């Protein structure tokens, strides 16, 4: 198959001619890719931010005329997937305590997300 064949041919031509250049550039790119990975609190912060903008975006989609709404099943399955894709030891027993006890009802869910976002932004600002 011609795409990866042509890409490996171009990489081989770029590696034989100028080998020192390709070596230094690949070592630089690899060290940036391994060492500038974000920590646990920054990943939790960006996860809570994308969850909060999706919650306030779906709450304004006119789901109902909003008597006392409830969460859809796909958002709950997405966040129970994200809870297993979170950090294991210490984030999960506190993140799981905020969707088992019927905290998702589109009002305490957004209030919980705002509380967690404010606490995380104060934690990252005291770094």
């Amino acid at each position: 198959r011609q795409p990866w064949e042509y890409l490996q041919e171009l990489n081989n031509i770029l590696k034989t001619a100028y080998p020192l250049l390709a070596l230094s550039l690949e070592s630089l790119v690899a060290q940036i890719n391994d060492r500038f990975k974000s920590t646990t609190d920054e990943d939790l912060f960006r996860l809570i931010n994308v969850l909060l903008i999706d919650g306030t975006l779906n709450y304004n989609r006119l789901p109902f005329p909003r008597k006392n709404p409830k969460l859809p099943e796909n958002t709950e399955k997405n966040l129970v997937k994200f809870s297993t894709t979170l950090l294991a030891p210490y984030i999960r027993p506190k993140f799981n305590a905020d969707f088992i006890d019927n905290k998702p009802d589109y009002e305490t869910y957004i209030k919980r997300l705002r509380y967690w976002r404010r606490r995380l932004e104060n934690k990252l600002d005291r770094a």
């Binding site: 903008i53 306030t56 975006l57 709450y59 304004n60 005329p65 909003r66 705002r114």
Partner: protein
């Protein structure tokens, strides 16, 4: 967005209270014995209530006057902000890029340079939504790619940006640069065609590869590309066209900024757009 958050937290608010206020005042009128079945008048009056109770239209200008230690610096900053925001509005208008929320617009506080991230154009799947006709002005037996804009406003010129630019610079620097850019792009005898052809074609290929129907690969795809290119070139040449009769240059641009700053259009957009700021 950072400037808006500093203004909200300098007082006793946080900008999710704006969403809470519009949700409560929009939910308090769906009830029985209907006082407002019309959503537009209620949306306009809660827009004015947001602009008066929470965020006045002098926040950005006051922040930037407090930012610089001299008025020469603020005056030169505003003089460059008007030209760079005119270029940003042109880049948002041509190629039909999406909603420019105030966290996607970045400003350099040492030059006045404006740029934006998430420069993703809006491609609507319908060929059905169009003020123009389907058959005669353009011929497309497929229907998927159109490059259309969804927003009520033609671009983003909110009250706070308009109070920062002022009245003299919005008339003499914003609209005139927005006119001369589109005049300079249609002069050089089809460079717009040559750039926009392949940069539209890659967007068409990504549009047919995002949704899993990549099998339509034919000169019909070139017809889609040329149709979208002619549409974008027509909308660009609409700005820089001066009439044969004596008419103010920057008149279509002034009508566009009249339709982009009216509260009857800014109230009909989403709350993540932040039309008050």
């Amino acid at each position: 967005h950072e400037i808006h958050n500093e203004f909200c937290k300098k007082k006793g608010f946080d900008p999710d209270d704006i969403q809470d206020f519009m949700a409560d005042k929009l939910n308090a009128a769906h009830d029985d014995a209907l006082p407002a079945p019309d959503m537009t008048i209620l949306k306009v009056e809660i827009f004015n209530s947001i602009q008066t109770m929470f965020v006045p239209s002098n926040v950005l200008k006051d922040h930037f006057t407090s930012l610089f230690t001299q008025f020469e610096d603020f005056w030169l900053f505003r003089k460059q902000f008007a030209s760079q925001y005119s270029s940003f509005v042109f880049m948002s208008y041509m190629m039909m890029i999406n909603n420019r929320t105030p966290h996607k617009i970045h400003v350099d506080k040492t030059s006045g340079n404006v740029f934006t991230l998430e420069m993703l154009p809006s491609r609507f799947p319908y060929e059905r939504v169009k003020p123009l006709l389907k058959n005669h002005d353009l011929s497309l037996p497929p229907d998927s790619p159109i490059f259309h804009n969804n927003e009520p406003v033609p671009f983003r010129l909110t009250p706070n940006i308009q109070s920062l630019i002022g009245d003299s610079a919005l008339e003499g620097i914003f609209a005139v640069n927005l006119f001369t850019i589109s005049r300079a792009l249609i002069e050089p005898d089809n460079e717009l065609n040559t750039y926009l052809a392949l940069f539209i074609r890659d967007e068409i290929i990504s549009w047919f590869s995002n949704l899993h129907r990549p099998i339509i690969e034919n000169p019909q795809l070139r017809e889609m590309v040329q149709t979208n290119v002619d549409l974008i070139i027509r909308k660009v040449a609409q700005l820089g066209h001066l009439n044969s009769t004596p008419t103010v240059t920057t008149q279509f641009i002034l009508d566009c900024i009249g339709s982009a700053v009216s509260p009857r259009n800014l109230a009909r957009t989403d709350v993540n757009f932040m039309p008050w700021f």
